[PDB]
Design a protein around this ligand. Sequence first.
Ligand SMILES: [Mg+2]
Length: 268
Amino acid sequence: TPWSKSELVRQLRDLGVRSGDMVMPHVSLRAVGPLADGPQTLVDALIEAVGPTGNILAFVSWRDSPYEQTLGHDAPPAAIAQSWPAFDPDHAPAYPGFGAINEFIRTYPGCRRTAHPDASMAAIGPDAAWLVAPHEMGAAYGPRSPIARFLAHAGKILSIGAGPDAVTALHYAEAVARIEGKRRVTYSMPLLREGKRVWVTTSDWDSNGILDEYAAPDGPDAVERIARDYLARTRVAQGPVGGAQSRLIDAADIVSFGIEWLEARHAA
Ligand SMILES: [Mg+2]
């Protein structure tokens, strides 16, 4: 029998989701199991477990991001620049690899989307507009990004059946870490300005490995190493949401652990 909305609300409140929280979810729906009204029940369960005063922030990105296709070039190549669609925040679907649930969060009425195409975030709540703006090229997960404001507002990372590699907030740690040889990347994104498609080239920190040791094709990356070290020596609330084992993580604590983890292993 599928999980009802009030069931998941019950389980989320045992975990520690209180009224007025700011929750960032990372969900593996296959681990959760069958839901009564589909993935929407988990969205509805999250929004009522958080109350009318709380907020939800999700890393949705963009399904058609030309990140690979423009990486490393000083300008978008001719074939991709001529035909690629601009990022339209109101209609651009979320990236499926980060979760099928994010497309449900994105289409929720009143949800706001950030301007960064590749690092797009979706927010629901009274502070959604303050969370989503500004998001600018060159600051995908660093200071002034939505993740930064998420950390300064007692945000909680809710992992529902997801792996430790899925902690997006830890990209803020590698962005601000005082370590030598941090990898950077140059890519181009097509943005809608007023009503015209525009191509913007920028540089930012490598989201797939802040250093060569963590950027290898074989696992694991810096985010996965930090999160596993953190969980191994931290008392975090853990319970079952639906059929999936879940954890409620203080975002500011794990990022502080991540900065200390990175700086204790690499010189300045
Ligand atoms: Mg508030």
